[PDB]
Amino acid sequence: SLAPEDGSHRPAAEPTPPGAQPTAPGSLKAPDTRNEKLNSLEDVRKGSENYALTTNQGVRIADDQNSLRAGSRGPTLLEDFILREKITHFDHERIPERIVHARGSAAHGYFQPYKSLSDITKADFLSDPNKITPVFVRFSTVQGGAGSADTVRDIRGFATKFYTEEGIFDLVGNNTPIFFIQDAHKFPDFVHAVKPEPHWAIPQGQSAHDTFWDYVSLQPETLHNVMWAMSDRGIPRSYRTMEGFGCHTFRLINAEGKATFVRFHWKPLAGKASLVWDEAQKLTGRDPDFHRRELWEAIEAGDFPEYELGFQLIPEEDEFKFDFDLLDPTKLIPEELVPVQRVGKMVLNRNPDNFFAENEQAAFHPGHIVPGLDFTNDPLLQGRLFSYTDTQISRLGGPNFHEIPINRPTAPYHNFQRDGMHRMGIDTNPANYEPNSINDNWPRETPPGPKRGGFESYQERVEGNKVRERSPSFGEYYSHPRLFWLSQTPFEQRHIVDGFSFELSKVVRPYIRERVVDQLAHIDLTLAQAVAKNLGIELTDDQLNITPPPDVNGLKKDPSLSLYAIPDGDVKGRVVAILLNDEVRSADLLAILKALKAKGVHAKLLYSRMGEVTADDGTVLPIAATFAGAPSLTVDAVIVPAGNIADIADNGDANYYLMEAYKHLKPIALAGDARKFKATIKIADQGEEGIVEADSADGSFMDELLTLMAAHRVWSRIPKIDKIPA
Amino acid sequence: SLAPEDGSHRPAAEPTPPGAQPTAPGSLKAPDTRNEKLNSLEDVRKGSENYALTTNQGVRIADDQNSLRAGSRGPTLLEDFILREKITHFDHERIPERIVHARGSAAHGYFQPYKSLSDITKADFLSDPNKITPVFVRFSTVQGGAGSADTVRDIRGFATKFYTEEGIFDLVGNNTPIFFIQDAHKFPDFVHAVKPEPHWAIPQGQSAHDTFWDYVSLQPETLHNVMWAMSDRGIPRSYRTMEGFGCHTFRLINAEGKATFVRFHWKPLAGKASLVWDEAQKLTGRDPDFHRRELWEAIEAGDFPEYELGFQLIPEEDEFKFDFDLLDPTKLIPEELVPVQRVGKMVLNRNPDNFFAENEQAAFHPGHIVPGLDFTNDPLLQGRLFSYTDTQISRLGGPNFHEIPINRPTAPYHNFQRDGMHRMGIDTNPANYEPNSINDNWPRETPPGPKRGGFESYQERVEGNKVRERSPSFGEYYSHPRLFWLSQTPFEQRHIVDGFSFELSKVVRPYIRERVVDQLAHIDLTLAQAVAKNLGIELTDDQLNITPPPDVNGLKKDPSLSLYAIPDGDVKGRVVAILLNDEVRSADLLAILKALKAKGVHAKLLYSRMGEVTADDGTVLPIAATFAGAPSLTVDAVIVPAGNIADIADNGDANYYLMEAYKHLKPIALAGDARKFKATIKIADQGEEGIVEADSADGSFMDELLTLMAAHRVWSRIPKIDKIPA
Amino acid sequence: SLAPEDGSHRPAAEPTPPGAQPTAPGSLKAPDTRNEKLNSLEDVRKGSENYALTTNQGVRIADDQNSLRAGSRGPTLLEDFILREKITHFDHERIPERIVHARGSAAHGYFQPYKSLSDITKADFLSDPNKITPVFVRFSTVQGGAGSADTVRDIRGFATKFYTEEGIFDLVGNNTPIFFIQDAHKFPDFVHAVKPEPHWAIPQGQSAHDTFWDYVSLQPETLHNVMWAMSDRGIPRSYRTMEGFGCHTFRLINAEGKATFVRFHWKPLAGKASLVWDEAQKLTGRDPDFHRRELWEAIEAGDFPEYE
Amino acid sequence: ISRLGGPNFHEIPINRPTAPYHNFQRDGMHRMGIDTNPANYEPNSINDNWPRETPPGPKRGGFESYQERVEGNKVRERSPSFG
Ligand code: HDE
Ligand code: HDE
Ligand code: HDD
Ligand SMILES: [S]
Ligand SMILES: [S]
Ligand SMILES: [S]
């Protein structure tokens, strides 16, 4: 019952392109990739090769195939302690999933700053460009359970645990720069409204249902993040190709005591890229693990996810200078008003070893700050500070969750806390209280100061009465949705319209749809009309007369809010499907793979069955998957080389493959006789922008294809796709 | 600095007698003591000197005296994460206590066999006299909570975790050879009956209440262990001075596959010794921690608890050779029939560092056996096998309780179990199932064999129908209680009578006392009538004529059942109270302490206040405690040296000290004018056995006293004590 | 039938002095003592007389004396679900005890105001002398575990849950008018200092040890409550004979929104009385359940604890 | 015990029998039923031994296992009949 003689069960411990080898635990795939945190886990990493199988008490097992019974057809005996331990451990494997962001995918990596930031913050991890800080990052959706699908329409979470020399800092952000609501007290109302409805627990992974649109219609403060969610920002192509934001105004505190307001950003160095809805939705069924898989395989390939940390910085004296409140988390700060300053780079370069132990049990919380950082009175942030420590008590089984290996600081920690369930640390301190004389008061308080100091809160002035009241400055709900809307390209706007139209069409109570359209009329009449038309709703005269909200501090638009308006394509790490026939022209394939390899673009070789095919020159080509097994949803572009095209010309799956890729705006390249497929997608002889064609696959042919892929999708094709039945 | 300039806050890191230094964590008290298990806990030991006080996330705290508030008289702010982390950990410090044996005290040590036992067992830890096995031993009561008193009347637990090279072996025993009930299905009934009654949760740490004696009167199988409990066995002097027993027949299995029946024994090398009831009960008030204290201080002094492991061995073909069933856990195996064969020595030589982490969290379970041992069909043991795994899932929070440091095997452990709450080990195996080819099937099963082989159960024959039935062979309840009774000395018998008499006086419903007397009449008429008289009950003529039960395989007594029939006194580690006066005779004191030192007996110098007094010759004598502070209950003998006896002669506390000690049968020694105290305890001028007296404290004065301490108590004094008002 | 012919196993359901009858669950001792909260608990009370013994799933048990085994001297079978359910429930009976005040004794009663307080508070339970509010009160020590002794020297807790028509109000007090410490941030320090020390877990129910006095000597804010604990306040004769205090300044608020500062008091109508130290300490050995017993029996006897 | 937080999962309303249930089991996390029985053990005299075991019978009887014959050695072995 053993490994094959040829050793093909075991993946090479070298970088390999997606699909070339089975995937593996990080420490086995990439044993030479290290950082301080990864090394500190060595105490708890457990191997397996050459070891005897045992109980958890260290007793060797002789027969792991059978229960102990009285005769070989008899009843199982209660003295079988081996059976009961095994079954007991299995019976208790599951722990509660996260209340939100239950679905998530994580990796290890490192961060370093570009230059010292000591003029604006005394945070040790930002103090030296050569101080390297280990990170563990988890990306997530929001609404769905841990076994829901990745490519849903939803906000995405982007949480970073920085293991700094002065403690853990968790930057717990999302992929849009705002949230749906203003005050933490409403968080359970909002989350309950977006989650599956309580009678029947439907729908999973979807805001497209009555309760969510009911809440939105009744709480116009939600409209800004709903605009983001209905745009293609809601359906990213990859965790590598979305932005991150810290959601609130926080403070930086420098050694002199100066406070600067800051908002945090992550810029994807692979560029901004999203799916289209039909693709995204169909992909939740063809591969509900697509983003998890893609993240893992990118890292195994050496296409390490890289992100640039950036800060929007506002001096304390400028708090009131905008037409929105800095502490309102439904408001963004336009980069045209306050530019993002580049701060440093984060590289994710190793996968975990065990998903449960490292991902599922990781606890991130935005209250985990360090000296040099501080909070503000953002009333959403304020409430978050209570929740992320509280929730761990049931999720991770008690207050010793910092001792779970993934959560442990690499910085020293010593204090007078004791006991709690599954206490690991054995304290030797004679004292468990301070002040004490019996241990000469160790461990001791440390004064604040420029570096290695104790934490002190910035002495912000507070003046006001004890009130449950929303600040009047928070009472404006339409100008930021409108700024976002006007900043999108015409195709992005169309996709926003289609997102609202699709979602409200699944709301069963029609008055809810009407009320949401009325809200849309307060943002932009063009948007409101286009949604209304799809829902068979007619705007009233009064609605047609609603005055649009004011510009945001004079802005008519801010192109940094669009995914696509300013080119930022990076093809490295993208993937092409290559549709084989049973006699591929090897000259075409040679040139195709050469050009792809030169830009770091991967290929998957697809056929109508598995196994191998032989090219015209005898080259044997292993088949990664069938046309149906790896649909065009999973790739960025499709190439069909020349050869025995008759072999696949009438294959329904091969034809469909191209109709689907065409519909979803992906570049297609057809060489030699593969040009016969132009008929399936109705391309005129003259050709079409977005379809690359020539007698063979050459320099020019690949250059054109790769240029298209740098632009992500072929937006000009959109008018031509209504008609395709796919 | 808060520590005193003279360093008097820090206990000397060397062996010191009780009271000489404050007690300390083990690793600080005795840093040079080691064994394989203590070494392996180093990775979780946390120090404190010279470290900064931090959060659990490693963030330094500047002010650990105040919450964060808006103004120094203002409200506490939700953003104070340092306060909430500290208070959250505190709020969740407690875990469920053990269902039974909640009260207990534990120490590290080591075990070594005297010779290889490979002819009778393949257990690795018994294979080589050079093989040294680390242990962790917890002693306990049974009924009371973790916060109940030590010197209650109750059974005691004696549990030993052996960290062997072939797995953990837990020997989970008690301090009597049998149990109260026959089948594990009744364990919740009997435990509910002894435990505090469910309406009002009274009484703590006591079987002296109606529900206990109701159950016993209705379940005569209980009477054997009840006899043990009512004897002075139920109130041991120390955990160092009681026997241990494994309770059941288990099996040894040798390399040839031969099974031998075995019962386990621990023999205390300090000898057998118990309190008397009045002393034990008062001591639960004066020092409810006395046995926990005595154990910790013995180890700190170098009076390491030592026990000899012993086996009663019965060949398989001898299963039915006795008057009782070997599988009946209410039956003992008399040493007169089957001798205890000596096996090895165990020494407890290090205290824990943190009581919660090491003691409270330790999990012992008798199903934890190793190759070379196996179970039998004892139907109480059979049900134990289920409980001790199950109970851990609530008590220790889940199925990874073997990853809590004290519970970890030192032997290797590898298998395919994954996840659960508090998962520490990060498994790198590509497989989490077997058989697998993707990891060449590792970790792998191991065939049984003479050494380092997999566990295989002994192939015992089973034959019968599926029944809920007690074996008829278990239906005899009186012969063992009778054997035990007849094996006791006349003074041990009197204490048994008084134990029943006192307990049944606290049963409110008179018919329950009557029913128990009826049971005693089935065991022994003398015993029954003597109880009856104390309760004002008269035996009927039918009761007077009940035939006594048969002897046990010809035996009319077995002196190994008596605590005192056969002297096994050892004075090392006992303690003497020395009653000071303001002008002590130094020549007496010098001679007292010299003789006590030579035999390893400790002393405490007591007076009417703290501080010092000065001897006749200027020597400054430090006072340990006041007469009231350290009552006679806590020592084994009392010595009063000569001098200014007038100083203390009319001190009520000093006179009462001698009265209490006299009542409790302790040796008393009076030198010179301290002979004046003879009037307070009514001693005749010619003296009496058990009272040492002379003009001065030597020649043979200390030898006489030490001879009396070797015999533990002055049993001959019993008739004199009823006259003394104490 | 196992009960005695003469029926002497069953306590009379009438008030009786201490020791005259066996004590009993309160709904069997005093079936006709009612209040709104006692009545509302009827849905969960379970009786026993005349019912068949069953599993928790409602299956009647024939033999509650034995496990199922292959032969009457054979091995116990894994299919014995009756045995396992019974042992499973047993194996999981315990829950964590309270971090502090683990030792405590409780009773049901009622509260009624002497006059309307609407001039100073809109609290509904204080709005009319006719407003009867059920209460459940728990008295406690502070330091010891749930199985520690009653007559230790310690602060006592006095916690009252008022089941009002406008919500639960809990008045969570102690038997002295102040506390040891000023700021909550130090509570784990002070509690760790008074609790059994961490290396060896000694001593139980006692402040008489190095770490408590170490903290006190370093934190003079403690000295006021320390004086109270060292006085005979720290060893009450009975929960019926001690005072209660709300510890903090709270506020009353009236219908006009006017705030008045308030501190709360409970005045024992049985008067104030404490033990002496020697007696209290010895009592922890002779009857560690003394105060729990004395409260239960006072109620059984009609000596109802009353406090103003 | 982990999924539903302890041994009182039968008191979670959907899981409750509609048949009567009474026994001597007590406590556990989330305990809802308040037992008034003076006894929490059997055999007991203080509550005249209630609730009481019930003999097997044709209807409303106690559970008794079928007395199937068992015969063999204690083995971890698959029956050859299963291969
Ligand atoms: C700006 C990014 C953001 C915002 C605005 C919020 N979440 Fe998150 N969340 C928890 C509670 C919580 C509250 C009370 C609020 C506003 C009042 C937010 N969220 C908004 C939580 C219950 O504490 C949570 C669930 C499980 C857990 O451990 O914490 C939680 C999760 C969460 C994650 C997942 C972190 C991870 O484990 O990967 C992220 C990225 C967010 N929140 C972002 C976030
Ligand atoms: C023979 C020595 C002995 C015997 C015969 C029994 N106990 Fe013990 N016990 C548990 C259950 C249990 C059952 C089901 C039976 C007979 C059916 C016995 N006991 C008799 C337990 C409830 O599972 C227990 C509670 C905590 C735990 O982990 O297991 C348990 C405790 C216990 C200890 C304490 C070990 C320690 O932590 O110090 C000891 C020495 C015994 N039992 C001995 C024992
Ligand atoms: C900051 C933490 C903290 C602080 C400063 C205090 N308490 Fe407390 N108290 C707790 C935290 C706590 C607790 C940990 O939350 C407990 C134990 C578990 C429980 O349910 O609450 C509790 C229990 C508890 C009880 C027992 C309730 C019961 O019987 O079930 C009483 C009577 C008090 N407290 C009273 C006081 C008094 C009079 C205080 C000072 C005037 C005080 N507490 C300060
Ligand atoms: S946010
Ligand atoms: S036993
Ligand atoms: S207080």
Tab-separated table of N, CA and C in Angstrom, chain A residues 616-644:
chain	number	residue	atom	x	y	z
A	616	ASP	N	3.186	16.807	-34.013
A	616	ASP	CA	3.682	16.419	-35.385
A	616	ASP	C	5.143	15.943	-35.434
A	617	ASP	N	5.937	16.293	-34.433
A	617	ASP	CA	7.344	15.961	-34.450
A	617	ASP	C	7.616	14.868	-33.429
A	618	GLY	N	6.579	14.192	-32.960
A	618	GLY	CA	6.806	13.140	-31.988
A	618	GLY	C	6.821	13.552	-30.498
A	619	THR	N	6.739	14.846	-30.219
A	619	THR	CA	6.764	15.320	-28.814
A	619	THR	C	5.491	14.773	-28.132
A	620	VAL	N	5.649	14.045	-27.041
A	620	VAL	CA	4.473	13.580	-26.298
A	620	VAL	C	3.969	14.677	-25.315
A	621	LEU	N	2.682	15.042	-25.388
A	621	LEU	CA	2.137	16.169	-24.621
A	621	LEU	C	1.179	15.656	-23.548
A	622	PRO	N	1.567	15.742	-22.263
A	622	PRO	CA	0.605	15.305	-21.230
A	622	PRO	C	-0.566	16.300	-21.106
A	623	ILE	N	-1.777	15.793	-20.846
A	623	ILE	CA	-2.974	16.599	-20.825
A	623	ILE	C	-3.293	16.972	-19.391
A	624	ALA	N	-3.362	18.272	-19.119
A	624	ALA	CA	-3.639	18.715	-17.766
A	624	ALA	C	-5.092	18.422	-17.327
A	625	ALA	N	-6.058	18.524	-18.256
A	625	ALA	CA	-7.495	18.443	-17.965
A	625	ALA	C	-8.310	18.393	-19.226
A	626	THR	N	-9.578	17.998	-19.160
A	626	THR	CA	-10.430	18.051	-20.351
A	626	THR	C	-11.035	19.436	-20.532
A	627	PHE	N	-11.572	19.703	-21.703
A	627	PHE	CA	-12.301	20.955	-21.947
A	627	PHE	C	-13.339	21.265	-20.834
A	628	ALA	N	-14.082	20.241	-20.417
A	628	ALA	CA	-15.118	20.379	-19.376
A	628	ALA	C	-14.514	20.450	-17.991
A	629	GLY	N	-13.387	19.779	-17.812
A	629	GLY	CA	-12.752	19.713	-16.494
A	629	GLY	C	-12.091	20.979	-16.039
A	630	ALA	N	-11.575	21.761	-17.005
A	630	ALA	CA	-10.990	23.046	-16.647
A	630	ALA	C	-11.526	24.162	-17.590
A	631	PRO	N	-12.742	24.655	-17.318
A	631	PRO	CA	-13.422	25.532	-18.260
A	631	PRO	C	-12.722	26.866	-18.389
A	632	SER	N	-13.114	27.650	-19.407
A	632	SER	CA	-12.480	28.901	-19.703
A	632	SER	C	-12.585	29.870	-18.528
A	633	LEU	N	-13.568	29.658	-17.660
A	633	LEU	CA	-13.650	30.468	-16.378
A	633	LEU	C	-12.340	30.563	-15.624
A	634	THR	N	-11.555	29.502	-15.636
A	634	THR	CA	-10.361	29.384	-14.799
A	634	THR	C	-9.121	29.965	-15.474
A	635	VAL	N	-9.269	30.530	-16.668
A	635	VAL	CA	-8.060	31.037	-17.349
A	635	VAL	C	-8.241	32.531	-17.771
A	636	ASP	N	-7.170	33.165	-18.249
A	636	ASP	CA	-7.202	34.557	-18.633
A	636	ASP	C	-7.362	34.769	-20.109
A	637	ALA	N	-7.072	33.738	-20.886
A	637	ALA	CA	-7.056	33.844	-22.377
A	637	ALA	C	-6.985	32.428	-22.910
A	638	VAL	N	-7.353	32.237	-24.193
A	638	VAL	CA	-7.355	30.895	-24.808
A	638	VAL	C	-6.579	30.925	-26.125
A	639	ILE	N	-5.710	29.938	-26.334
A	639	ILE	CA	-4.964	29.858	-27.593
A	639	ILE	C	-5.273	28.525	-28.224
A	640	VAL	N	-5.494	28.505	-29.551
A	640	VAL	CA	-5.751	27.238	-30.223
A	640	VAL	C	-4.675	27.178	-31.307
A	641	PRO	N	-3.685	26.268	-31.151
A	641	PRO	CA	-2.636	26.121	-32.154
A	641	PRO	C	-3.122	25.333	-33.380
A	642	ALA	N	-2.346	25.390	-34.469
A	642	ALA	CA	-2.711	24.674	-35.656
A	642	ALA	C	-2.457	23.168	-35.501
A	643	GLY	N	-2.822	22.404	-36.527
A	643	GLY	CA	-2.567	20.985	-36.531
A	643	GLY	C	-3.731	20.270	-37.142
A	644	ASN	N	-4.070	19.112	-36.590
A	644	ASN	CA	-5.252	18.396	-37.019
A	644	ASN	C	-6.533	18.980	-36.389
